[PDB]
Amino acid sequence: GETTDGVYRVMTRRLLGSTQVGVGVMQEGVFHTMWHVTKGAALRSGEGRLDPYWGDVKQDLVSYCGPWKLDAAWDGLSEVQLLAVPPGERAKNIQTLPGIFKTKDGDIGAVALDYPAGTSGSPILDKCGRVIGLYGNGVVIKNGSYVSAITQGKRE
């Protein structure tokens, strides 16, 4: 059904009323979200059906209709925008300067903003408007605050 590029809400009618479980990015005919949001299950877009194509639980990413299309990366210096799509609330751009997640396999960007769990999948953008990763998988620090990795897939 809806093929338009843009940011989408991922909803379910299983619980009470309608519940927002996450967010995703439609781009080049491919829907990109976080794995933990859909758990790989098929998605409905009105009258149409989106079938999963690629997925990885460790990366916490999943694509529908085609391979991962998002390839832009954070430059390590510039500020970024979290186009946050919170449950029951309008889309909001929140500019922030990312921190770092240091791992045994290398460093990753990290956005320190607090949002309900149904906000996972929200895209993180650069000065050109390019999606440099997805917000929604990270850690809770000593003060109860949330820090998310800038999770980006690999393009083929």
Binding site: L50, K92, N93, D105, V147
Partner: protein
């Protein structure tokens, strides 16, 4: 069954609300995609 609803365009907003800190954190990623804090 899950479904998708459009919520907007992917554009940079000049003069947006600038908030948030930049922490340097030591983390570990397990086989299940769960980050943890290393100390």
């Amino acid at each position: 069954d899950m479904y998708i609803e459009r919520a907007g365009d992917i554009t940079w907003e000049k003069d947006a609300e600038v908030t948030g800190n930049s922490p340097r954190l030591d983390v570990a990623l397990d086989e299940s995609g769960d980050f943890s804090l290393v100390e």
